């Protein structure tokens, strides 16, 4: 509801950004290894087995709870058996929608002060974000980044409208339906990502401040958090824990500020991120002076408050991620704070100053500085788009674990755009596993071999008579694979083959182990293969096992596995589900969550209080 040039300008700018961003995300097509882990859970859920990684166990492997079910719905609607295309389409659409939403939300912030004026809208903070090459790397992978972008854009627009909605129509701020919708949207943040709660919850607090009475506060708090409470109850009843389990596997001991600073420097130095920040701060502090240099309830619901809320949210997210320790990818975890910090300057107005503040030649010089600053920002973006990137250090393991994943997997395979699971069959140990499985009708345990790029085989116990014969379509024994990269194996082997890792993403035994040494980020807490041999229907004697395994350790682990307290936790996720199982799992989730075991079997025996088995000799 403003003048014609203001209406058209904004529109064209938006279109431009969208187009470019789309192109920038089509020339870099790939799917990550971590993106193929969601698809196995989706396949299990569409097969009638439930939200699990393996059919016989109830283990949570996805930390989004919304991306997984959205992809499940998409794969249910689409009758095609390919799920990578669903993920590609959804990620692209969500990223573009989020950028459009944030631009439209920022325009309404400046709209009220442009009444009866001639001005234009120019894209400032939207171009900067899409100029960064890692932003276009992760705009199309199998992760949930686009979902985060869309959620943040919607929340920003709704909060701006809520802050500006104060007009006192009938002694009330806004309508009740809008308040309920905003409360539900704010409460829905913990499901999307856990650390995002600090954003959404903050918004909720503001609403609770502005309510006139206690009745409205109770209504808002009840409406806001119904769905997260229901899902928490379901998770406690079904999985027997208070947390997804991947967070349970890590056993933190404190802050790591030095690694976070190293990660921040590594992110900054390819692209020189300080110059756009300085220029955008200059533009922001310059645009405010033209508008003019110049109880708690009125103050909280004001346009000045939402800007501070967004900036504080961005700073808090950055501090949390820096204290955590960073990541082993180039720029993955520092994009959400960057998106949050650039929201208030996503689009800027350019206009001739009023006659009542500066006369004639003083207004002709105020627009020139704004134009020159915008031109400098555009030049920086154009330069930084065509940047080589991290450099010739993203293909090996250096002193730090940070690496560029897209080029790593492009050279690991032989494809410039690895998009499907058939493209990942060219990994060095991928074609051999199929033949290894096909050559063992009675089943086996597969381990990496230290001499070549094939697999070592540990056979299983043969079936007894009258059980081998009573089989449908022949008899197939149990197959288990022990490895570190799960997505490529999980999307290839099949739904009746058990795929386990060592850190504890899908291994319930390795997630209950304690920590002794810090080591490298993410590649520091690995379980011995002797534990894997100990549990499973496989042989345990030297004529059938490789020479780098210790049989005394195998016997000690086998004897330690019969602890009464370990048995309860094991059957919490393996016994058939019913009503009493749901109730017992709800009552004992807290104590199951805070349970730890020791890596070395002898010390475990010592802790539990069980006798030591005699030497095999």
């Amino acid at each position: 509801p403003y003048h014609v040039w203001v209406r058209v300008s904004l529109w064209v700018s938006v279109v431009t950004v969208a187009a470019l961003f789309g192109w920038g995300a089509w020339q870099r097509r790939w799917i990550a290894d971590d993106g193929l882990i969601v698809l196995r859970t989706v396949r299990n859920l569409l097969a009638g087995n439930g939200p699990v990684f393996n059919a016989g166990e109830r283990v949570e492997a996805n930390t989004s709870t919304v991306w997984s079910y959205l992809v499940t719905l998409g794969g249910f609607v689409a009758g095609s058996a390919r799920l990578e295309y669903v993920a590609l389409v959804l990620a692209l659409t969500l990223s573009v929608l989020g950028v459009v939403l944030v631009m439209f939300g920022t325009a309404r912030l400046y709209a009220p002060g442009l009444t009866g004026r001639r001005a234009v809208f120019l894209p400032a903070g939207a171009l900067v974000y899409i100029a960064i090459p890692p932003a276009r790397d992760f705009a199309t992978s199998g992760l949930e980044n686009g979902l985060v972008l869309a959620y943040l854009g919607l929340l920003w627009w709704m909060m701006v409208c809520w802050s500006q909605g104060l007009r006192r129509p009938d002694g009330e701020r806004t309508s009740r339906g809008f308040d309920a919708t905003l409360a539900v949207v704010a409460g829905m943040s913990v499901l999307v990502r856990p650390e995002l709660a600090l954003i959404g919850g903050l918004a909720l607090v503001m609403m609770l401040v502005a309510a006139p009475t206690w009745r409205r506060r109770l209504a808002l708090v009840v409406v806001g958090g119904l769905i997260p409470v229901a899902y928490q109850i379901f998770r406690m009843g079904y999985y027997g824990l208070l947390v997804p389990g991947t967070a349970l596997a890590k056993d933190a001991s404190g802050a790591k500020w030095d690694q976070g600073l190293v990660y921040l420097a590594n992110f900054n130095q390819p692209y020189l991120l300080w110059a756009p920040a300085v220029l955008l701060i200059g533009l922001g502090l310059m645009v405010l002076l033209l508008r003019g240099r110049p109880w708690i309830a009125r103050t909280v619901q004001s346009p000045p408050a939402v800007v501070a809320f967004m900036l504080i949210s961005g700073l808090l997210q950055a501090v949390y991620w820096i204290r955590q320790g960073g990541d082993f990818m180039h720029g993955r975890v520092l994009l959400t704070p960057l998106f949050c910090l650039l929201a208030p300057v996503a689009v800027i107005p350019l206009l001739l100053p009023d006659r009542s503040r500066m006369a004639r030649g003083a207004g002709y010089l105020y627009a020139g500085a704004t134009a020159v600053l915008w031109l400098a920002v555009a030049g920086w973006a154009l330069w930084a788009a065509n940047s080589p990137g991290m450099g010739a250090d993203a293909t090996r393991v250096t002193y730090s674990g940070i690496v560029d994943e897209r080029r790593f997997y492009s050279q690991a395979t032989g494809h410039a755009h690895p998009l499907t699971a058939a493209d990942y069959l060219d990994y060095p140990r991928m074609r051999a596993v199929l033949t290894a499985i096909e050559n063992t009708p009675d089943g086996a345990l597969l381990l990496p071999s230290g001499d070549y790029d094939r697999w070592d085989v540990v056979p299983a116990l043969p079936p007894p008579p009258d059980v081998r014969a009573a089989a449908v379509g022949g008899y197939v024994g149990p197959h288990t694979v022990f490895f570190t990269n799960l997505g490529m194996l999980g999307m290839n082997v099949g739904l009746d083959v058990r795929v386990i890792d060592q850190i504890g993403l899908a291994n319930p035994l390795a997630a209950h182990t304690a920590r002794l040494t810090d080591g490298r980020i993410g590649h520091d807490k690995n379980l011995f293969p002797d534990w894997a041999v100990a549990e499973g229907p496989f042989l345990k004697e030297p004529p059938w096992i490789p020479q780098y395994l210790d049989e005394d350790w195998i016997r000690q682990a086998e004897a330690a596995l019969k602890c009464p307290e370990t048995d309860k936790v094991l059957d919490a996720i393996r016994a058939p589900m019913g009503f009493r199982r749901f109730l017992s799992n709800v009552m004992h989730a807290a104590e199951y969550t805070r349970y730890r075991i020791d890596r070395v079997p002898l010390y475990e025996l010592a802790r539990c209080g069980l006798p030591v088995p005699e030497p095999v000799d």
Partner: antibody, heavy 125, light 109 residues
Framework: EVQLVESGGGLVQPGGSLRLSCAAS????????IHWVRQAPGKGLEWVAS????????SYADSVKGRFTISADTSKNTAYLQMNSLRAEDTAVYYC??????????????????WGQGTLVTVSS | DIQMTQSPSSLSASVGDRVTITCRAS???????VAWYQQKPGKAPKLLIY???SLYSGVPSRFSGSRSGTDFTLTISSLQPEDFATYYC??????????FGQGTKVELK
């Protein structure tokens, strides 16, 4: 070329503390086993402690189990050995060494490949 | 606890002779991870034999090892003047503790 450079050592009062360092070149300490071995004057060899960063495993001898401490700083490729309550019979030349690993995965043959030069520690006074 | 008894303790041999050193354990040695080392006075040890029957890279062919049940043996045929040192037998499981033996010394006459 693989190199192991050792530093930190001298005279210490009985009941004192002294730390040892070892810098590695040519390989990553995150995928190999590191051992400490000492040799008392006119005596044989004696294993002290070992560490594995890939597995989070740490082991000590029975004589120095509660008083010594071995760690690793993968950011600088360095290994450490803290020594506390140094009784007078802890004087010897201390060696750092690397294990002989399999080529295609993280397994060991049970032997030692490369030995450092050594750094003597005198715990008498 | 595993203990290794190395014998003999001192050998007198001349140039171009055959030398045999035997290291003996007590318990089961199914690990078969016995390794042999060489150390000259004032230097660090050098690896010669690993897995009790396998010869390391760069080591001359004169050195050999054999597993006679619980007994282990090192063999040198036609020693050269650059072979007079002190030797050690070592045992270790895949993760377990390292155990050494009492060194032997060879002289020249």
């Amino acid at each position: 070329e693989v190199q192991l450079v050792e530093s930190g050592g001298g005279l210490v009062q009985p009941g004192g503390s002294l730390r040892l360092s070892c810098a590695a070149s040519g390989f990553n300490v995150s995928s190999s086993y590191i051992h400490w071995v000492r040799q008392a004057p006119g005596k044989g060899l004696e294993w002290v402690a070992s560490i594995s960063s890939y597995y989070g495993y740490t082991s000590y001898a029975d004589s120095v189990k509660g008083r010594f401490t071995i760690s690793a700083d993968t950011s600088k490729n360095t290994a450490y050995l803290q020594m506390n309550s140094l009784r007078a019979e802890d004087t010897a030349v201390y060696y750092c060494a690397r294990g002989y690993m399999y080529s295609h995965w993280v397994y060991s043959y049970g032997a030692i490949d490369y030995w450092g030069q050594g750094t003597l520690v005198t715990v008498s006074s | 606890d595993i203990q290794m008894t190395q014998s003999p303790s001192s050998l007198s041999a001349s140039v171009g002779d055959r030398v045999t050193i035997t290291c003996r354990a007590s318990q089961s040695v199914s690990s078969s991870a016995v390794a042999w080392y060489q150390q000259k006075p004032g230097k660090a040890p050098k690896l010669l034999i690993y897995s009790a029957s396998s010869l390391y890279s760069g080591v001359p062919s004169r050195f050999s090892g054999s597993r006679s049940g619980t007994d282990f043996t090192l063999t040198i045929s036609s020693l050269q003047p650059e072979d007079f040192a002190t030797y050690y037998c070592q045992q270790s499981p895949p993760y377990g503790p390292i155990t050494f033996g009492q060194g032997t010394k060879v002289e020249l006459k």
